[PDB]
Amino acid sequence: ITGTSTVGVGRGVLGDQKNINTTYSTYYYLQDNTRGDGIFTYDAKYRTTLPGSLWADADNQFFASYDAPAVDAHYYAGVTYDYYKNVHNRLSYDGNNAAIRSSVHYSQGYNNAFWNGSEMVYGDGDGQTFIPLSGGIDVVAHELTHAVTDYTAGLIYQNESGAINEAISDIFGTLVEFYANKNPDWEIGEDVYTPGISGDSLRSMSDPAKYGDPDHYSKRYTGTQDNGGVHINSGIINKAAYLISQGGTHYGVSVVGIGRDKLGKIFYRALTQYLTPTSNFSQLRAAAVQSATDLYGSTSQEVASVKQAFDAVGVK
Ligand SMILES: [Ca+2]
Ligand SMILES: [Ca+2]
Ligand SMILES: [Ca+2]
Ligand SMILES: [Ca+2]
Ligand SMILES: [Zn+2]
Numbered sequence: 001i002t003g004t005s006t007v008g009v010g011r012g013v014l015g016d017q018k019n020i021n022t023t024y025s026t027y028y029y030l031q032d033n034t035r036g037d038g039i040f041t042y043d044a045k046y047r048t049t050l051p052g053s054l055w056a057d058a059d060n061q062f063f064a065s066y067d068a069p070a071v072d073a074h075y076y077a078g079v080t081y082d083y084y085k086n087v088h089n090r091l092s093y094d095g096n097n098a099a100i101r102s103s104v105h106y107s108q109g110y111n112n113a114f115w116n117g118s119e120m121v122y123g124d125g126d127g128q129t130f131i132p133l134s135g136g137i138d139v140v141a142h143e144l145t146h147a148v149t150d151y152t153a154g155l156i157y158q159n160e161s162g163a164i165n166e167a168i169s170d171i172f173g174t175l176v177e178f179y180a181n182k183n184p185d186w187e188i189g190e191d192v193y194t195p196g197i198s199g200d201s202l203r204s205m206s207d208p209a210k211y212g213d214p215d216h217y218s219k220r221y222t223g224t225q226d227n228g229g230v231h232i233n234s235g236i237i238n239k240a241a242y243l244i245s246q247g248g249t250h251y252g253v254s255v256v257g258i259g260r261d262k263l264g265k266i267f268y269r270a271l272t273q274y275l276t277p278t279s280n281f282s283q284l285r286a287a288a289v290q291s292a293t294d295l296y297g298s299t300s301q302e303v304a305s306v307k308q309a310f311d312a313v314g315v316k
Pocket of ligand 1: 057058059060061062063
């Protein structure tokens with residue numbers, strides 16, 4: 001769309017009010033011209049055909065309940081773009097300011113969200129297991145990071161490489177949650193999952209076993225479900241990443257934490273410089289050690305922590 005950049009206001013899934021970047025041309029559209037080549041949000045109108053209609057609104061105010069998921073998908077995509085740019089100096093997911101597109105109200109009662117290789121897609125949830133998925137900044141950032149991985153390491157979506165791909169998305173979705181300072185934690189999806197139950201979440205990075213995911217390599221899943229457990233075995237890496245950041249003792253191995261910022265620097269370097277489509281856990285560890293080495297010196301504490309963390313989860 002060609003029009004005048006402006007700012008509108010609305011309410012998100014959780015009821016919070018926020019300002020969003022819109023474009024005016026007869027209607028006000030969810031098109032943010034301020035970030036790279038633009039952020040565009042579409043209405044899939046409960047269908048599965050994509051992307052749907054670019055989101056149009058008559059008055060630049062988005063307080064209808066049907067508006068909520070669009071407001072958040074649009075807003076959280078801006079935040080994530082900012083995170084990447086400000087913190088890692090990366091322009092959009094391709095490093096060249098590619099437009100970011102998302103569709104909301106995808107299908108009926110759809111309990112998931114995903115990056116399809118071209119854009120983001122968010123279901124509204126069935127109202128019991130989930131509420132509209134774009135209300136969780138960690139979910140939004142998890143999906144967008146899949147775009148980043150696709151353009152860089154290109155980790156294939158299955159077995160160990162696929163688990164690494166998933167872990168990368170949870171790690172960065174969590175870092176983004178901390179960046180925005182939106183009640184941050186080391187849990188995944190807590191804000192949109194089981195609205196009826198407080199205190200739970202989809203996955204836990206601090207204690208993956210809390211939900212039955214592995215927290216040690218000896219406990220990995222070897223079957224075929226979930227593409228070979230991409231969402232299961234990601235727990236081993238997630239745990240390693242939490243330990244690198246926060247420190248702790250796990251299975252008798254002690255790790256000194258080096259904090260979130262360095263965690264992000266180290267994993268982003270590994271991702272963009274050293275990982276390849278078929279990398280396995282053991283390769284991830286070498287990549288992570290090489291990155292810390294690059295960044296902090298081979299005799300650094302940082303390197304030492306990365307080593308300890310992987311030894312703690314049994315990845316050699
Ligand atoms: Ca309106
Ligand atoms: Ca949170
Ligand atoms: Ca979270
Ligand atoms: Ca819940
Ligand atoms: Zn994912």
